[PDB]
Write a protein that binds this ligand. Structure first.
Ligand SMILES: CN(C)CCNS(=O)(=O)c1ccc(-c2cnc(N)c(C(=O)Nc3cccnc3)n2)cc1
Ligand SMILES: CN(C)CCNS(=O)(=O)c1ccc(-c2cnc(N)c(C(=O)Nc3cccnc3)n2)cc1
Lengths: 350, 350
């Protein structure tokens, strides 16, 4: 097969470029951003993803700068980066050599939905926990992903490892600095984003994660709608009409406009009868109008819904051990170090 | 079959209640708003649509108040209105008895798209012209539809009559009064809406109409995207990067935020080779960053793309005469009365 050799910079550590050789290059995705390839490293035979985006030399690539800082088991790792040609002349392309993870939460959920089944709760627990760890980690650096959705949640079917991907919308959120309200994908947008707030926090990712949890439990999106109005109607049907203070906490200059007076639908009535009560309690605490009232990612990890993952006898349905779940760092725990007493169970990491 | 008899108020004119009897009630639509039924009037056998929404005890229904003012050949007419008990116990439902039109632009476009064909240009001309007349009319009253999309464009397959429907998001726009930015459906949203402007005008409907025209010509949406960021990338790819003044005209709070520097894609290169040059010129004049630079609906009617509709020999492909096209009123011409010299062709005067 065709072998491509490049001089690429390691993603972490010292800027010491090395020759990287890869083969079996196939397109695995396309989008507004550019293209995503799968390749096999000639050396190790290990599969990698190559995200290729057009780069302007007027400014530094924001995604590259965020990726260079990150090293977590639930986040696709930046292995190398290099510059190349691709489809123009004077146009330079930035290439991100990342961990390759073969499946997505989107594809897995759709299999179950099409087969009229729900994903077993053990996988809902494993996937959601790993997502909350990835979020606790990036938020500890002040970084908000801003595009949390099932398509950006990669899965290894055999190990049950989940890796967050796509840092194309990610941004370090600084208090008092305004941010664009048009980030985040339909169905997963926090109500503050729908109301056009520019003063939002990292808690928008927590709302998005709650939408993913509810969807994995329901078999379909909890807040669908092709417009913000329809999305808000779906939110109001479950949460009840937001109070004037709740509206003020989301977007201050939107208190005058009115919505239909709907009484709060009991959360137990939202989900099928055999839904674990702890799964419902987690949703209600993630899916809050007031951004400051939502659980933080680290607190969501410590929630009772994830107690089975902390059991020394837990195994995957395929008989394998669960993946790494307790290798917390000081960085990851920084928002609330006492939580480590729940997070790292007695049997873990000796 | 089951016969329902109600005492309803006529949609226009004096409050002289009429006894309305209907049969063969079927659900034709379901949504965040409520239900839309199809029914057959007992005496004429004529089909009607019944839009059943919940009546808010606090205020008067905005959609009903707008519908009561409208009487146009390209707008679904409010024939009658009445109140009922409905599905939910002890609450009041408003029932809007409307003209029933059997097809939608959405369904027709999807039939051609699935068959790998494009809708013949004569229908693109007929549908778009009738949509621009409906918009010239509502805008003459200061009313903005705010949800222009192929699903809200009803069609009669035999007569080629188009009727605008769904006034659930419609609002009278008053200068200096702020409006919600979360109206309008994905793909059809004006860039000002994406940027979260609350000072937008009726020209948001003109942008939406341009998206419908481009889509009928392309066979697919022109600006797709599951997020505002992706939609903006698609807009920038065609229109080119917006200038700081263009950004200021859309939303002034967004002047500082930077987008990727893309040169404007020539409009002729976006559509298939045999696309009429006049169709492309119409798109470019509807799909402008600056809201005030977009053609008004009445000016869009007067565009050269619609010259074939003004031909005395024009016929539908099925051999029938084209539907009513030149019966302009003083109300609908009010924005620019001199345009009547183009709009009402010499043969229509005779
Ligand atoms: C079956 N066909 C259509 C190909 C496989 N498609 S898929 O949806 O199962 C899929 C797509 C992407 C990835 C994947 C793997 N590793 C990655 N690291 C990335 C990645 O970084 N994706 C990404 C997407 C958008 C923007 N930036 C990055 N994607 C895995 C499976
Ligand atoms: C799924 N199919 C087979 C059933 C519906 N047929 S359809 O989608 O082609 C369709 C839907 C609606 C209408 C129709 C007809 N007359 C109307 N007057 C309305 C109407 O007012 N619709 C509407 C929709 C949403 C909100 N408000 C009003 N709709 C016609 C065809």
């Amino acid at each position: 097969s065709k072998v491509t050799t490049v001089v690429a910079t390691p993603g972490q550590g010292p800027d010491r470029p090395q020759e990287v050789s890869y083969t079996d290059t196939k397109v695995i995705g396309n989008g507004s951003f550019g293209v995503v390839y799968q390749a096999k490293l000639c050396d190790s035979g290990e599969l990698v993803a190559i995200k290729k985006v057009l780069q302007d030399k007027r400014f530094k690539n924001r995604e590259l700068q965020i990726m260079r800082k990150l090293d977590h088991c639930n986040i696709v790792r930046l292995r190398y980066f290099f510059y190349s040609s691709g489809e123009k002349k004077d146009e330079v392309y930035l290439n991100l050599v990342l961990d390759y993870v073969p499946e997505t939460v989107y594809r897995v959920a759709r299999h179950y939905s099409r087969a009229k089944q729900t994903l077993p709760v053990i996988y809902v627990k494993l996937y959601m926990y790993q997502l909350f760890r990835s979020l606790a980690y990036i938020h500890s650096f002040g970084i908000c992903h801003r595009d949390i959705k099932p398509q950006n949640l990669l899965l290894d079917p055999d190990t049950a490892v989940l890796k967050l991907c796509d840092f194309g919308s990610a941004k370090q959120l600084v208090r008092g600095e305004p941010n664009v309200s048009y980030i985040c994908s339909r169905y997963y947008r926090a109500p503050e984003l729908i109301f056009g707030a520019t003063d939002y926090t990292s808690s928008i990712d927590v709302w998005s994660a709650g939408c993913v949890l509810a969807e994995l439990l329901l078999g379909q999106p909890i807040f669908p709608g092709d417009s913000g109005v329809d999305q808000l109607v779906e939110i109001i049907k479950v949460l009840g009409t937001p109070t004037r203070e709740q509206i003020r906490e989301m977007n201050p200059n939107y208190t005058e406009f009115k919505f239909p007076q709907i009484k709060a639908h009991p959360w137990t009535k939202v989900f099928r009868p055999r839904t674990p009560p702890e799964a419902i309690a987690l949703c209600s605490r993630l899916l809050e109008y007031t951004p400051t009232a939502r659980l933080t990612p680290l607190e969501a990890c410590a929630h009772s819904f994830f107690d089975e993952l902390r059991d020394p006898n837990v195994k995957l349905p395929n008989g394998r051990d669960t993946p790494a779940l307790f290798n917390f760092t000081t960085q990851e725990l920084s928002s609330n170090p006492p939580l480590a007493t729940i997070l790292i169970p007695p049997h873990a990491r000796i």
